[PDB]
Design a protein around this motif. Sequence first.
Motif, PDB file in Angstrom:
ATOM      1  N   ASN A  57       0.824  -1.199   0.000  1.00 14.33           N
ATOM      2  CA  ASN A  57       0.000   0.000   0.000  1.00 14.33           C
ATOM      3  C   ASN A  57       0.872   1.270   0.000  1.00 14.33           C
ATOM      4  O   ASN A  57       2.067   1.202   0.250  1.00 14.33           O
ATOM      5  N   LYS A  58       0.262   2.409  -0.311  1.00 11.54           N
ATOM      6  CA  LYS A  58       0.962   3.695  -0.441  1.00 11.54           C
ATOM      7  C   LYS A  58       1.990   3.649  -1.558  1.00 11.54           C
ATOM      8  O   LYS A  58       3.063   4.244  -1.446  1.00 11.54           O
ATOM      9  N   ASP A  60       1.897   5.205  -4.211  1.00 17.51           N
ATOM     10  CA  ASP A  60       2.061   6.597  -4.642  1.00 17.51           C
ATOM     11  C   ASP A  60       3.225   7.290  -3.923  1.00 17.51           C
ATOM     12  O   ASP A  60       3.722   8.296  -4.403  1.00 17.51           O
ATOM     13  N   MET A  61       3.646   6.774  -2.771  1.00 13.67           N
ATOM     14  CA  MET A  61       4.733   7.424  -2.025  1.00 13.67           C
ATOM     15  C   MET A  61       6.066   6.685  -2.139  1.00 13.67           C
ATOM     16  O   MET A  61       7.033   7.033  -1.449  1.00 13.67           O
ATOM     17  N   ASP A  85      -2.796   2.152  -4.127  1.00 14.64           N
ATOM     18  CA  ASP A  85      -2.981   3.404  -3.393  1.00 14.64           C
ATOM     19  C   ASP A  85      -4.381   3.384  -2.765  1.00 14.64           C
ATOM     20  O   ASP A  85      -5.388   3.693  -3.423  1.00 14.64           O
ATOM     21  N   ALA A  86      -4.450   2.979  -1.503  1.00 16.23           N
ATOM     22  CA  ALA A  86      -5.745   2.818  -0.852  1.00 16.23           C
ATOM     23  C   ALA A  86      -6.429   4.169  -0.668  1.00 16.23           C
ATOM     24  O   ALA A  86      -7.652   4.268  -0.726  1.00 16.23           O
ATOM     25  N   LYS A  87      -5.633   5.217  -0.483  1.00 21.55           N
ATOM     26  CA  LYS A  87      -6.182   6.531  -0.175  1.00 21.55           C
ATOM     27  C   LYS A  87      -6.825   7.164  -1.408  1.00 21.55           C
ATOM     28  O   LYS A  87      -7.959   7.642  -1.350  1.00 21.55           O
ATOM     29  N   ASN A 129      -0.939   1.675  11.047  1.00 27.54           N
ATOM     30  CA  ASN A 129      -0.698   2.775  10.109  1.00 27.54           C
ATOM     31  C   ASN A 129      -0.266   2.417   8.683  1.00 27.54           C
ATOM     32  O   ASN A 129       0.157   3.305   7.948  1.00 27.54           O
ATOM     33  N   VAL A 130      -0.366   1.149   8.281  1.00 31.36           N
ATOM     34  CA  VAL A 130      -0.034   0.784   6.905  1.00 31.36           C
ATOM     35  C   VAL A 130      -1.186   1.041   5.924  1.00 31.36           C
ATOM     36  O   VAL A 130      -1.000   0.947   4.705  1.00 31.36           O
ATOM     37  N   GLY A 131      -2.363   1.346   6.462  1.00 28.76           N
ATOM     38  CA  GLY A 131      -3.516   1.721   5.660  1.00 28.76           C
ATOM     39  C   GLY A 131      -4.668   0.724   5.664  1.00 28.76           C
ATOM     40  O   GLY A 131      -5.466   0.686   4.724  1.00 28.76           O
ATOM     41  N   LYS A 132      -4.777  -0.067   6.728  1.00 31.30           N
ATOM     42  CA  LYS A 132      -5.782  -1.138   6.797  1.00 31.30           C
ATOM     43  C   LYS A 132      -7.226  -0.614   6.787  1.00 31.30           C
ATOM     44  O   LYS A 132      -8.074  -1.120   6.047  1.00 31.30           O
ATOM     45  N   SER A 133      -7.514   0.382   7.622  1.00 30.95           N
ATOM     46  CA  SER A 133      -8.882   0.872   7.722  1.00 30.95           C
ATOM     47  C   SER A 133      -9.235   1.715   6.494  1.00 30.95           C
ATOM     48  O   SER A 133     -10.377   1.692   6.029  1.00 30.95           O
ATOM     49  N   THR A 134      -8.248   2.434   5.957  1.00 33.51           N
ATOM     50  CA  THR A 134      -8.391   3.091   4.651  1.00 33.51           C
ATOM     51  C   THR A 134      -8.765   2.117   3.523  1.00 33.51           C
ATOM     52  O   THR A 134      -9.705   2.359   2.760  1.00 33.51           O
TER      53      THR A 134
HETATM   54  N1  GDP Z   1      -0.518   8.684   0.489  1.00 32.56           N
HETATM   55  C1  GDP Z   1      -1.223   7.527   0.979  1.00 32.56           C
HETATM   56  N2  GDP Z   1      -1.671   7.487   2.244  1.00 32.56           N
HETATM   57  C2  GDP Z   1      -2.333   6.462   2.774  1.00 32.56           C
HETATM   58  C3  GDP Z   1      -2.600   5.314   1.961  1.00 32.56           C
HETATM   59  N3  GDP Z   1      -3.345   4.414   2.895  1.00 32.56           N
HETATM   60  C4  GDP Z   1      -3.416   5.109   4.078  1.00 32.56           C
HETATM   61  N4  GDP Z   1      -2.856   6.179   3.897  1.00 32.56           N
HETATM   62  C5  GDP Z   1      -2.779   7.094   4.962  1.00 32.56           C
HETATM   63  O1  GDP Z   1      -1.874   6.533   5.977  1.00 32.56           O
HETATM   64  C6  GDP Z   1      -2.413   6.820   7.313  1.00 32.56           C
HETATM   65  C7  GDP Z   1      -2.717   5.537   8.020  1.00 32.56           C
HETATM   66  O2  GDP Z   1      -3.921   4.997   7.433  1.00 32.56           O
HETATM   67  P1  GDP Z   1      -4.824   3.952   8.239  1.00 32.56           P
HETATM   68  O3  GDP Z   1      -5.889   3.402   7.371  1.00 32.56           O
HETATM   69  O4  GDP Z   1      -5.590   4.584   9.351  1.00 32.56           O
HETATM   70  O5  GDP Z   1      -3.856   2.797   8.767  1.00 32.56           O
HETATM   71  P2  GDP Z   1      -4.209   1.569   9.725  1.00 32.56           P
HETATM   72  O6  GDP Z   1      -3.673   1.770  11.090  1.00 32.56           O
HETATM   73  O7  GDP Z   1      -3.440   0.362   9.269  1.00 32.56           O
HETATM   74  O8  GDP Z   1      -5.755   1.285   9.703  1.00 32.56           O
HETATM   75  C8  GDP Z   1      -3.667   7.571   7.085  1.00 32.56           C
HETATM   76  O9  GDP Z   1      -3.422   8.980   7.259  1.00 32.56           O
HETATM   77  C9  GDP Z   1      -4.053   7.290   5.689  1.00 32.56           C
HETATM   78  O10 GDP Z   1      -4.780   8.428   5.187  1.00 32.56           O
HETATM   79  C10 GDP Z   1      -2.130   5.334   0.631  1.00 32.56           C
HETATM   80  O11 GDP Z   1      -2.315   4.375  -0.094  1.00 32.56           O
HETATM   81  N5  GDP Z   1      -1.443   6.447   0.145  1.00 32.56           N
END
Ligand code: GDP
Length: 290
Positions: A57-58, A60-61, A85-87, A129-134
């Motif tokens: 995930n991410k 894009d970064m 890119d989950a976001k 913070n890896v983007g699971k809930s996103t």
């Molecule tokens: N630029 C970018 N940010 C992301 C992506 N997925 C999550 N994020 C951001 O990374 C942060 C952590 O996301 P989150 O879903 O809450 O992570 P979780 O702890 O695993 O559920 C958040 O601010 C998201 O907006 C992505 O694919 N690209």
Amino acid sequence: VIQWYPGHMAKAKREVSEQLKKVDVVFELVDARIPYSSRNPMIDEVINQKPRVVILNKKDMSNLNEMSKWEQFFIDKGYYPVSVDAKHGKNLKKVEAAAIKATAEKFEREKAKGLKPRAIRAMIVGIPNVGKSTLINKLAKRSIGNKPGVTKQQQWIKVGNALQLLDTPGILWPKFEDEEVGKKLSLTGAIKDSIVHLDEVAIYGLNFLIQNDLARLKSHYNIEVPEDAEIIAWFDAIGKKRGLIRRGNEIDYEAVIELIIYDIRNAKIGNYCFDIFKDMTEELANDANN
Ligand SMILES: Nc1nc2c(ncn2[C@@H]2O[C@H](COP(=O)(O)OP(=O)(O)O)[C@@H](O)[C@H]2O)c(=O)[nH]1
């Protein structure tokens, strides 16, 4: 923010293993910026040979070429890696597709035994913070007890045509034991928590950039620095150019450090993968036999 302590870890392991028993396939979500260092150190024992989709995930970064080396690595382990890119909602249809491929052998043997075809059950697992809930929200196309004191039950989300996704991720702890991994995790913002000195995280980040994208670093802060200068000169040139000073014209190092960490975490300078595959050969060899 999650507080890890032994009991919380034991509870997390127990509960994720339990949830894993209800699924056909597990989505291990990692940070594309650090596909290997953002993995739970016990992830293979928890997952225990369950068909696996590794989601970087991410994307894009990060850097695609570097990510491809990690994808090859995951392929060689027998996993099905995909990058998303989950976001910003880029490339999500490949999740279901990957799930179908990862469980294809299971469902072929079920069809041979005369069982009815059925939706694939999946869950997402990974460190904070890896983007699971996103990712879960994006795949559901909606934000996932709202009365105080009322307990949420776990539910299945219909995704696509073939996939049922558990609406609750399994959350596991990051690697703790290694100081360089600590620095990588802090640079990506996986751990915004102490006991890894920010000045050293900043030094690590700056050195990474000096070695891998020097012109970009310079043009970004609009600075030019002697190549034989020590790292302190970088903090100083940045501080001076940005006017981050105190007590006359001494450098406000705390402010410089915070600026560098912010810019690296939020990809303000560039899109990097900090797990350099060819530099991690020995670490991979040590971790491997297990
Ligand atoms: N630029 C970018 N940010 C992301 C992506 N997925 C999550 N994020 C951001 O990374 C942060 C952590 O996301 P989150 O879903 O809450 O992570 P979780 O702890 O695993 O559920 C958040 O601010 C998201 O907006 C992505 O694919 N690209």
